[PDB]
Symmetry: C2
């Protein structure tokens, strides 16, 4: 039950995080040795509905909810972080960046379809598995992780704490994300908190010249202050720059 | 010169981060095999004065600037993060927490003496070495790390972007830090950015009952909104709760 060991095919390894109910512990499947993530819960509503609803969501690049076993969740485990891999390789190609951006955007499209807005797309939520596939965590309706997002990646609507943050906020975050993989620098960022918020609020940032007309073009339409003029996920998936070398499994049925 | 290898006793291993001039690369000393951190620079003022000034600062718990070798810096390397270690051991003792808090506070006292205010004390800056000693990084006058601080740990003066942030801001951050090691939860923290800032601004937080009168007492005086009434580092070092089991090497000469 504790960091000791064993629970129906799974042996516990070492708590990964704590959180209001139980903890999250690393564990490896008894026979296969597949690493897994065990989120424990109990001692309390429509959460069970949620947990049940998550076991249905499946996507190559979203951390999967393998199966529920107190209340053990059994989640897919990815140990590395997308950006740790990116800093490693000095200057990865624009085509290398795009490859990741496509997996991410596809994943977002997938969730928005199932009516789930992430709202917290940031580096600590972009993981990678042994095959270099992105795995987005924290998707679906602890002190190691803060409840409020990393400002540098939040849309104006979020910085300003608007009562409604629609799927357009994910596009903005993805905008920042794309920007950083290509420019290796944050779009908005100042040592002064208030100034960082000012810039984000007025979409104040500069696009580096080494950016292809394609990339810079897409970034531009994603980082738009007015939620209504911000480009949509589907428009992004139909973009020429985006489309290049786009793996078929990433394109939904309707597109 | 690159991620290839070798530079006067040091062999390069794999870039740890990038930053406006050069990068930071992990390297191990050719003979001893001591891991080191290599920050590269060139292509430009009073920085050299600064670099020179840092080579003089020495403290058991501050990342040391071993020696300058373009412009290679050679920094002490710590791979783990204080809080990763803390989540591991389920509930570490109050005396275990205090041990870390003393090393941290001593380190801060040390820098404030040499007229250096950190201003960005957060989890990603609290490292640990193989002996479980804290090593504070980013001390002394990149996309993996943002320029603005992690709000949850910043003092009101910092959240509000006041033109002057004195050493009192470090006390506040240390307050949050102490709080989290003991309560395993953030003092101020809300999914709403504006609300998080409101709470911080009005020092709105609750002290858990399982806190000793000592600990809770110290926290209280650190998280004070008015910079002038906030407890001082030296008063903290003379506190009864703080003093318990305080290793002699951590106490400065004058105390």
């Amino acid at each position: 039950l504790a960091d000791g060991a064993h629970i129906g095919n799974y042996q516990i390894v070492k708590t990964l995080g704590e959180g209001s109910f139980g903890k999250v512990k690393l564990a490896y499947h008894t026979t296969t040795g597949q690493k897994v993530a065990l989120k424990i819960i109990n001692k309390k509503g429509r959460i069970e509905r949620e947990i049940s609803y998550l076991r249905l969501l499946r996507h190559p690049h979203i951390i999967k909810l393998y199966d529920v076993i107190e209340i053990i969740m059994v989640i897919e485990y990815a140990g590395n972080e997308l950006f740790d891999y990116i800093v490693q390789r000095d200057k990865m190609s624009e085509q290398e960046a795009r490859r990741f951006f496509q997996q991410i955007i596809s994943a977002v499209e997938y969730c928005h379809r199932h009516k789930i807005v992430h709202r917290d797309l940031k580096p600590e939520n972009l993981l990678l598995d042994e095959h270099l596939n992105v795995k987005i965590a924290d998707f679906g309706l602890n002190f190691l992780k803060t409840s409020c997002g990393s400002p540098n990646y939040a849309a104006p609507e979020v910085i300003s704490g608007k009562l409604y943050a629609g799927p357009e906020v994910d596009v903005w975050s993805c905008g920042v994300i794309l920007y950083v993989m290509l420019c290796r620098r944050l779009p908005f960022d100042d040592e002064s908190i208030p100034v960082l918020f000012k810039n984000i609020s007025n979409g104040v940032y500069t696009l580096p010249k080494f950016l292809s007309p394609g990339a810079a073009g897409l970034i531009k339409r994603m980082l738009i202050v007015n939620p209504l003029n911000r480009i949509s996920i589907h428009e992004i998936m139909q973009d020429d720059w985006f489309k290049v070398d786009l793996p078929e499994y990433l394109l939904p049925p309707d597109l």
